[PDB]
Write a protein that binds this DNA or RNA. Structure first.
Lengths: 93, 279, 267, 93, 278, 255
DNA sequence: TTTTTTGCATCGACTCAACTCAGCTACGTTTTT
DNA sequence: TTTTTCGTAGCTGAGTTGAGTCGATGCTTTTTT
């Protein structure tokens, strides 16, 4: 069981509500919760299945170095960047 | 264009939340709106039990939603007493139901189940070759004894467990704490039994009434968890005891793996009936 | 026995009576003594006091679709009284009683007694055969091209128009049947012909009367081939259920299916 | 050491960078990290001191029931509401 | 208005990050890496203990200033990741600690005590008594060779002594180059630690005279418990790109074996073995 | 000690020598043999190859503000030479020697020998007194009322002394000593900086602080100090002063 | 010899993405045993 | 007797907040022993 954060942009209302089923929406498109691994993977496939032409980034607490991991769906100008086994964000144009 | 909505495991949920305004559905999410328009989002999929207080009015879609995410809705009155419940209509799976049934119709199997309940509730085995109603005599006696002892660990004026079916202040503060607390327990227990796929009506110690099995299961853990803190709250003579009882019930349910342990409790309780389970 | 379908308002309480309220004020008056079950159709909103009232008089609330083509929520979940469940149960796990219940189901469905030399697993071959025969015969008395009922429950539009019509129809049928079984006070999971799944008995009851009304109108809609056959098959089922009181007549049939157990029923 | 999330809106650039010192910015005004308690209150006092009158919500993993806690600075149309010992968000019209 | 910017504890940070693209600039007061294609990558400089700058990087004045304020040591490295230069907090020394270390260094009795605790912490059993500084450091030489031999044959790696060529880079053995990358990382976090504690990296006890004497002293205590074994582990597979693999292994070791966490207390405990209290 | 202040460009290497680059091309060429210390002023950008070169020839890089009114970062952090740190240390911890230096500092500051009356605690009272006299008299020639919420004049004085601490720290780092190890001032990380700066504070910096207070400001006091440090080679002559202060220590210096 | 050249924050106008809501129109529906 | 009444989702066009950049200007400064 670990803390989970889901950040959405330009996502259809139905996914906003679906995420509001399990998580608490502290900001517009910023959701928070505490879930299991498989609840997280379900939440994810809900995201993938429903984001359409929005873009979502999901991050959760772990045992790793940085202390968390995160994955994305769709395109955003802040992308995860691979750097010596560290995941960081980069801007583009 | 569309995705299924499946209930998440009970051990992974919040035990209960008390509402409230009107419950509506927005974009497929449970929403609580008051008279001033304030919408409050409720993670219904993350709760095992939603207690609806007076002054709430539920839409059709809302009850639908609660059912598909497998959250039990419970309409309660003042003094937080359980009144009505709503959940998944086909929420029973036949193997488990018939298991429970065959366990209920044979009276030897019934007896063993009762004895396992006894040994789980009081810790050490039941006097052998005694019967169901004799066992419930013993259980009555041990119960009063327990109430007395609690009453004098917590220093609360106690004259027995009596309440009234029609008004509100005709009962002692303690009895009220007790009925609110027990209402919460019956909440999560009904949630558990329904989730497991059994029938709340088919009981072994208690029978005949619609929550017999609920009573049976709950009474096993009723004095290990909620009632002591009911007394702890009664000790303080507060103005509005039911909400404090709620909070106390929630932290108790979580601190002691109560949700986590409820389904397995049911399973081994029934497993004491010599017959092998479905899976 | 007695029940009422409410829709398009708020159910609240006045003077201790069930009331259906809209923008025009009180739409439907209901005295507490006259309903055992209230079917809540879409667009309804239940007050707290209404639920309280229902609870005092032991009234079953059931959240349904229109005319009960879908069942969504139920008060008294998991059955209300122990006896109906144990009655049904005892009828189901004993296989002599199970057998007799099955043959009564058979004769209620086909109008003729089942051969005593056959058994349950022997019988369902026979009724299977009659079913293929009936589907064939219905198929183009109404003019719809037929090569048999095949489906895969993982996708919907692979099957031909007639088959998806049939499946919308039978789904609705399962709706009102589940509704009826819930109203009678029995459990949808404990079946006799069908077993194992949570809606076994629903299937059992429903296929008895499936060929009365519902599959024929399924075929009619498939024949004239409109744009959205699913919704019109659903609506047509709804109107059939409403005009022919299907839920109302479903209950006694159930009581007789089970009473065909020689064991005396509850009160 | 627990996972930390900081969501900012309408905050001056200097606070955005100041937060970019310790946390990783996965989306615009959405920062993530894993910090100690005292680092969290330091970051917070940075927020109070630099947000001017934009609005920020900071949430972190905890041992409590919901599994996390969260705090706000400034006004937002999503405010925390106390409900039976649970903090939830509510909207205003 | 603006708020002060103070560094966070070393134990709470990521051990090191290697930067190697374009130019390091400051934006809105944050450490930023920009390449020639415009891609800006933000670096949580305050959350790192060491920023290793590889060739082709160019640091702004404001950047080095920033790194110093958040107390991150900057380290300029070469090919095979060898440490070549460092930058940080100019007044980074604390008077009581500096004088403590110094007076510990000046009389050779205390020096000897300090050296012996270093010995005991490095090898886990007390040092043979009655022996002197150059003698025990002779012993240290012998045991070190024994160690290199032993590691060389557990990991099954051909070993011909520790030799390198300070002119060409690919003139050195695979293993040795791994060893030099690893030792470089360790010197990184060790320098960070010694500077953070407020001591001087130049004032050593076993090693003396050169600017990283104390760094060598401290690091050699824990170098064979942590980094060199995994250096040999990398050397065994003969990868195409040994340097990056060595970094990954070093960070992984530092996090698993509490290295950043225990480095300062190690220092304090080494120096405390020598007489007078802090 | 040789040093060069570089400003508004990129420091890179050409031919194996330090070059300062603009879009206008090579701005300042510097051979490796002529600098021991390179002061990097604001608006500078250091290449990797430049640092590599500096490291090879042992050239000290110091990130400073303009004219070194602020010191921000230093290569070879914590001093680079063991011998000088221990020299200074040894001079500071035993108190007869500490006494040597304090008195040399006294004479460099006031032009008059310190009375043989002495240790360190009795005089910090005297220099305190001579200081009150000096502030008073300076306050009286420039005609300024004499008695961060406060009067303009003291804020001027503090901007000025801050700059002074800047250039002094720069010098101490350039010489190779440690800013923390002081003789008059002790305990604090910049003790020696205070010690050195208070020797030369009054000949230049405080008077023009007063001139600026009279003309009525922190920015202009800072910049005016920048011009003072630049015009009168302050950092350049600070180093020998430090070396001779410490050399007053009975003990022979390093090489 | 008259060599004024750089990095970085602030500010103000502009573009642009996206949230939020109101009024309008459909609809009671995600099925198969 | 001719009783169309409700909740919820999708769509489209408007108000609105806020992020992100460009180009121009100011500055190399967050100080006190």
């Amino acid at each position: 069981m670990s803390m989970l954060v889901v950040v959405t942009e330009n996502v259809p209302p139905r996914l906003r509500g679906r995420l509001a089923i399990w998580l608490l929406e502290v900001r517009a498109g910023v959701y928070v919760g505490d879930v299991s691994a498989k609840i997280r993977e379900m939440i994810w496939e809900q995201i993938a299945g429903l984001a359409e032409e929005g873009n979502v980034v999901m991050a959760w607490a772990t045992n790793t170095e940085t202390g968390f991991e995160f994955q994305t769906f769709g395109l955003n100008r802040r992308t995860p960047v691979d750097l010596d086994g560290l995941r960081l964000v980069s801007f583009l144009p | 264009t569309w995705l299924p909505l499946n209930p998440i495991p009970l051990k992974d949920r919040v035990s209960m939340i008390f509402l409230q305004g009107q419950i509506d559905v927005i974009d497929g999410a449970f929403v609580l709106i008051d008279k001033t328009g304030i919408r409050t989002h409720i993670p219904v999929g993350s709760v095992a039990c939603i207690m609806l207080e007076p002054g709430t009015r539920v839409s059709h879609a809302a009850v639908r939603l609660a059912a598909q995410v497998g959250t039990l809705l419970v309409w309660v009155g003042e003094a937080g007493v359980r009144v009505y419940a709503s959940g998944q209509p086909g929420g029973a799976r036949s193997d488990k139901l018939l298991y429970q049934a065959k366990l209920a119709l044979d009276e030897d199997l019934r007896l063993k189940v009762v004895r396992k309940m006894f040994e789980l509730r009081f810790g050490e085995p039941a006097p052998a070759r005694r019967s169901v109603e004799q066992l419930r005599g013993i259980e009555g006696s041990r119960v009063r004894a327990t109430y007395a002892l609690l009453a004098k660990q917590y220093g609360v004026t106690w004259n027995g467990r009596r309440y009234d079916p029609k008004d509100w202040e005709k009962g002692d503060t303690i009895n009220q704490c007790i009925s609110a607390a027990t209402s919460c327990l019956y909440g999560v227990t009904e949630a558990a039994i329904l989730a497991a796929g059994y029938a709340p009506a088919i009981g072994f110690v208690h029978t005949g009434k619609p929550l017999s099995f609920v009573y049976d299961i709950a009474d096993i853990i009723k004095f290990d968890t909620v009632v002591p803190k009911a007394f702890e709250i009664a000790r303080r003579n507060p103005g509005e005891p039911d909400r404090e009882v709620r909070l106390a019930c929630r932290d108790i349910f979580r601190s002691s793996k109560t949700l986590a342990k409820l389904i397995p409790l049911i399973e081994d309780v029934l497993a004491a009936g010599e017959i092998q389970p479905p899976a």
